[PDB]
Subunit: 260 residues, 4 copies
């Protein structure tokens, strides 16, 4: 409706916090809200990222950089957000730890969407979303479509850059594989910025998104460490496995031969 | 339930974003989600603040700093958050501005709840939320009850500090009035830190909260200026809100300490 | 040289901290370092800002946003920096306050420089730096040359924008004055972003710079309120500076855009 | 002295920046200023840290937390600051990379002091600082002394906590070794916060210092990846630094508490 609380639908949003602790624990609210605010930022992040792909498809560089600039800010919020949770100590967590289901952020569809959209494709990850065919659908679509990185590659191909013909038609279902034959394409760009400034721009943006995304990944792991700790794989050690993953290897590799 | 989505009620949460732009505008999502995350934090902030009042009533200091510590982290998110909204250019806002009603954050009951709870009480303000009598009642409660700051002077009083006897009971509905007799009480606290380290810790926690709150107030204002411009109420109203103060005595002593 | 400490000349830098408190005060290290770190960023800020103007003179757009982008990060550090100083309680400050002279950051050449570079000129300032003819000379250089904003207006003038002829040559030593005739120029750009995407990006970069600056300005004022106090000049001077603006036209158009 | 630039010694501080690129590369100023500001906070960090150790020795809890609170903010700035250096692309670095020397932060005497101070003791590290007997002597002093953590464990021993007698006296020159007998000491502190609130507070302050320091450690590595890429030593060396832990017992107890 026309009301502030009506437009934002606050009665719906503000009644979604249901602590399931009979006695009612003080620190459960934070646990819930810290999860919901993230889910909200992820939604927006997905909305802006999808626009990054369309803009690239359309050779609209200034538009894409814009949406990417917002994504970074959103991603940064996701990251910065862990600071509040860092206040949840083991003595507090202990109070409502039990009444928690076996669930985990691994079931985060939106998160998965992001991961897929950025290039970390994984077919076997479709079954974990069977309960909801609609969402599984939205996930399969992005899974079959080239990633942000791939659309960025097909973009460079449309403007003289020696992009391996394979990036014209392939099974996008399979996650991108580090392609060494992509190093010279990025050496040219990094050695002639004044000329390839557009591409240059998107490159650093891409590096920004991946980097900021790793910060989130890391801050995420550290928080878990101080809450439930390690125990050394699927768990705290697993979150350490994701840190090794990269969205745009080629981009980082070139850093080792650029200007040699 | 046991679901990740079921425990967080994501279907109910992720279906609250309802863009009213008939043609459907890209940047309108940011408008909504930006408001919603803030509200979710405002709700947590209240949760914590309320406990800050119960611990003070119980003389539970270390427990009180803990919640205020969290409150500060949250208040810091709220402030930092604007950075993402500062990316909403006037060109964009121009595309869904019209569909928006005359309503503004002035209707944020939760916000108003934080305002009163911190001391900035305003009786003739509970009218705007006449629509929701249930929430109105919850608002009138914190209004008629001692503020976070007032329940702090009570704490000082129980431990032998020269706190005016008027604080033991009065019209809580009326905002706090700068008290000159409070100056000597805090000058003492700050000159004998080791002796009054507890009251000295709580004092700075209060100065932090207010400062942070003012940061949010300022950032909010600046974001508005870069979206709808300045040039009465409107963005000018926000300007006045910055002159407000929660714990005047706390800031005043700063100029008398050790003089 | 080629050593770590030798390249960075750490011996010289690391010996620039000289607390003058005879009895020696623990918190005098923070007060000294809080300033020196900021003065180091300011230097970078000036180094990057001077390159922004040059790049703007040569129509080198992407380069300009590149240096400005860094300039925004630096400003963001300078701003977030106040956090560590907010931990300077009146009780601690009170201990080494007396050993400090009447001086103030008002004597910061780098700060004034930046202030001049952005357009906030003020000839009556060169006088406070009469002790340094070499540095003062630097101020005059930026005090007589077109400001960042002005160099941006001339930029627009070379690409067919109704930029008033009075900007091709004038007394740059005089602080810029709001011009209603610039309103239509920025409405066109803001209502046709695709077309004017370059000018559009540069406008938001400037709006970002001024905004981050205000935050730095504001945070500065608040930290002072909590250390010293509210005594126009003094703390009232810090409050007044907030009223200032580097690119008014840029913030005014926000009211008559897309209407 | 009484002058702003006098007291802060701005002529000394602002003349320590000497790029070695003959043609004078625009981006070398950042490279140099990025390090100097760090070394500035590091010097403060150590100052506050050393104050913590003493406080703990005298059983001055609220004083210890205070300095530790400032330490956190310094580390935070030291961590946040990586954003500005992230704006240096491989193209820019390339222009002055060649004239750079083989020196790395591994030569930072101050950083090392911090590392040792927190417990990461390393006898064979004194050698890399032999060129400076005055500084080496400073490191050897904090190397043979109990670290912040060790002094903390000595703190607990003074109040009924079952702390292994070995911490009463031993070779402090050797880095602390994970001890399973400490587990029950922290389980008792976390499962009885109302009783051991002081201990509880110091335990979380310590957990924050190490976490923030790990963040700084991680951003540092990430910024290195985008400047010089990845491809024992170098980048793979920064990856191992994250595997280190200052207070293992504090993190491992997280899995035994409440069970
Ligand atoms: C109380 C704080 C939290 C703790 C202790 C925690 C702990 C964990 C653990 C132990 C895992 C391991 C994966 C598995 O076995 O399923 C995990 C995964 C994950 N968590 Fe968290 N979590 C916390 C908060 C959050 C929040 C607020 C989000 C919001 C999105 C989140 C998102 C995720 C995601 C997406 C994964 C897996 C994705 C991947 O494979 O990279 N977690 N978490
Ligand atoms: C597109 C960005 C935004 C703009 C342009 C904006 C603008 C305004 C304006 C013009 C007012 C003045 C009151 C009136 O005449 O109705 C106002 C008040 C207010 N806004 Fe915002 N707003 C924005 C976002 C937000 C968000 C996300 C929140 C969430 C907390 C918020 C909370 C408030 C509050 C609480 C007040 C009134 C409080 C007081 O009485 O001091 N606003 N806003
Ligand atoms: C202990 C914390 C600080 C306090 C209490 C403080 C206080 C003040 C006060 C009272 C003024 C009024 C102006 C005057 O009469 O000269 C002022 C101005 C100023 N201070 Fe700070 N200051 C602090 C730290 C700093 C630092 C670290 C910088 C670093 C640049 C700084 C820079 C300035 C500048 C540039 C001005 C005046 C410029 C303008 O006119 O806008 N101050 N300060
Ligand atoms: C241009 C950005 C920077 C890059 C690419 C970079 C790169 C590196 C590399 C490759 C190493 C590994 C050791 C070696 O083989 O020499 C290293 C170590 C180190 N760097 Fe940086 N660095 C940068 C900036 C800084 C700054 C500003 C500081 C601040 C003091 C710093 C402090 C250190 C320290 C302390 C170590 C070693 C500590 C340990 O043993 O874990 N670096 N750096």
């Amino acid at each position: 409706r026309l009301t502030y609380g009506g437009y934002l639908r606050l009665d719906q949003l503000l009644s979604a916090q249901q602590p399931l602790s009979e006695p009612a624990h003080h620190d459960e609210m934070l646990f819930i809200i810290q999860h919901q605010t993230s889910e909200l930022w992820l939604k927006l992040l997905a909305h802006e990222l999808r626009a990054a792909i369309v803009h690239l498809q359309r050779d609209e560089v200034w538009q894409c950089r814009k949406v990417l600039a917002r994504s970074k800010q959103v991603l940064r919020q996701l990251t910065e957000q862990w600071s509040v949770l860092e206040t949840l100590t083991p003595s507090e967590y202990m109070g409502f730890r039990d009444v928690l289901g076996p669930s985990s952020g691994f079931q985060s569809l939106q998160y998965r969407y992001i991961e897929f959209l950025l290039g970390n494709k994984n077919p076997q990850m479709l079954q974990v979303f069977a309960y909801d065919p609609a969402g599984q659908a939205r996930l399969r679509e992005v899974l079959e479509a080239p990633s942000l990185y791939e659309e960025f590659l097909r973009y460079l191909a449309r403007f003289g850059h020696a992009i391996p013909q394979q990036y014209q038609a392939r099974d996008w279902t399979a996650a991108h594989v580090a392609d060494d034959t992509l190093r010279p394409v990025f050496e040219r760009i990094y050695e002639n910025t004044d000329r390839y400034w557009r591409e240059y721009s998107l490159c650093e943006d891409l590096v920004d998104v991946e980097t900021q995304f790793q910060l989130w990944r890391f801050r995420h792991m550290r928080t878990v460490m101080r809450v439930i700790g390690f125990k050394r794989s699927s768990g705290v050690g697993f979150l350490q496995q994701a840190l090794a993953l990269t969205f745009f290897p080629e981009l980082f590799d070139v850093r080792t031969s650029v200007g040699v």
